[PDB]
Design an enzyme around this catalytic site. Structure first.
Site, short mmCIF file in Angstrom:
data_model
loop_
_atom_site.label_atom_id
_atom_site.label_comp_id
_atom_site.label_asym_id
_atom_site.label_seq_id
_atom_site.Cartn_x
_atom_site.Cartn_y
_atom_site.Cartn_z
N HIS A 133 -0.23 2.64 -5.04
CA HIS A 133 -0.27 3.99 -5.67
C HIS A 133 1.13 4.57 -5.92
O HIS A 133 1.23 5.47 -6.78
CB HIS A 133 -0.98 5.00 -4.81
CG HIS A 133 -2.46 4.88 -4.84
ND1 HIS A 133 -3.20 5.04 -5.99
CD2 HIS A 133 -3.34 4.74 -3.82
CE1 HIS A 133 -4.48 4.94 -5.68
NE2 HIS A 133 -4.59 4.72 -4.37
N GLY A 176 -7.33 6.26 3.76
CA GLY A 176 -5.93 6.35 3.29
C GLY A 176 -5.75 7.38 2.18
O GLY A 176 -6.75 7.80 1.59
N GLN A 218 -1.95 10.75 -5.63
CA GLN A 218 -3.38 11.11 -5.80
C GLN A 218 -3.64 12.62 -5.77
O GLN A 218 -4.69 13.03 -6.26
CB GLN A 218 -4.21 10.44 -4.71
CG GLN A 218 -4.23 8.92 -4.83
CD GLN A 218 -5.10 8.27 -3.77
OE1 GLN A 218 -4.61 7.87 -2.70
NE2 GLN A 218 -6.39 8.18 -4.06
N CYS A 265 -11.65 3.38 -4.03
CA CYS A 265 -10.50 4.27 -4.22
C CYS A 265 -11.14 5.61 -4.54
O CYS A 265 -12.21 5.62 -5.19
CB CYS A 265 -9.58 3.71 -5.29
SG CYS A 265 -8.03 4.62 -5.50
N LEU A 266 -10.60 6.67 -3.97
CA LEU A 266 -11.11 8.04 -4.18
C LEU A 266 -10.80 8.48 -5.61
O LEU A 266 -11.59 9.24 -6.18
CB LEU A 266 -10.43 8.94 -3.14
CG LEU A 266 -10.62 8.50 -1.69
CD1 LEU A 266 -9.60 9.18 -0.78
CD2 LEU A 266 -12.05 8.75 -1.22
N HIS A 274 -2.72 -1.48 -0.46
CA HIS A 274 -3.47 -0.54 -1.32
C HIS A 274 -2.69 0.78 -1.43
O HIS A 274 -2.48 1.25 -2.57
CB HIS A 274 -4.85 -0.33 -0.73
CG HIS A 274 -5.67 0.64 -1.49
ND1 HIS A 274 -6.66 0.23 -2.37
CD2 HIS A 274 -5.69 1.99 -1.49
CE1 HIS A 274 -7.26 1.29 -2.87
NE2 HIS A 274 -6.68 2.38 -2.34
N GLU A 275 -2.23 1.34 -0.31
CA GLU A 275 -1.63 2.69 -0.36
C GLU A 275 -0.29 2.63 -1.08
O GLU A 275 -0.02 3.56 -1.86
CB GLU A 275 -1.54 3.35 1.01
CG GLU A 275 -2.90 3.66 1.60
CD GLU A 275 -3.74 4.62 0.78
OE1 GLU A 275 -3.15 5.46 0.06
OE2 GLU A 275 -4.97 4.53 0.85
NI NI Z 1 -6.34 4.45 -3.25
#
Ligand code: NI
Length: 158
Positions: A136, A47, A52, A90-91, A132-133
């Protein structure tokens, strides 16, 4: 391959602005979308949310299979109160995993990139990725949702 912002950056804590109708169906948006697809692929995410890569818009892409989806201006509704613990990375939080408890079952709605409604009811991992997405887009990373810190750690230790 745009840069993934790391935890600490103010831009990951902003509430994101909605994609204005003017960008729907546009060359500008399609370019942003492809940028996020390259970047998500270059680092092996399932994702990615536009904030981000420092882009202040309600736009996420994602897809134990989940379909490739580009979701704009989303709204989540829990379908019940059943919750479920699962591992998240998470990246923007390199080197770490936590256990996070999210709704087991959600409806999600929004717009595809052309302006067409999306409307889906999903469970399990598909519901986890989307929650999760969308966190953000309201300035929330998973460590702010952890309630069991025994399960928060470095990926190489756990
Ligand atoms: Ni994330």
């Amino acid at each position: 391959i745009r840069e993934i912002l790391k935890m600490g950056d103010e831009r990951l804590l902003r509430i994101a602005q909605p994609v204005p109708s003017e960008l729907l169906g546009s060359e500008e948006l399609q370019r942003l979308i492809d940028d996020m697809f390259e970047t998500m692929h270059h680092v092996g995410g399932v994702g990615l949310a536009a904030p981000q890569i420092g882009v202040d818009l309600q736009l996420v892409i994602f897809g134990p299979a989940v379909p490739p989806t580009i979701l704009l201006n989303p709204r989540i509704t829990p379908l019940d109160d059943e919750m479920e613990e699962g591992w998240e990375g998470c990246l923007s939080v390199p080197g770490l995993r936590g256990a996070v408890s999210r709704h087991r079952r959600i409806r999600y709605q929004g717009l595809d990139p052309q302006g067409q409604p999306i409307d889906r009811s999903v469970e399990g991992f598909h519901a986890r990725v989307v929650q999760h997405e969308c966190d953000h887009l309201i300035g929330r990373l998973y460590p702010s949702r952890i309630t069991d810190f025994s399960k928060f750690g470095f990926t190489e230790v756990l």
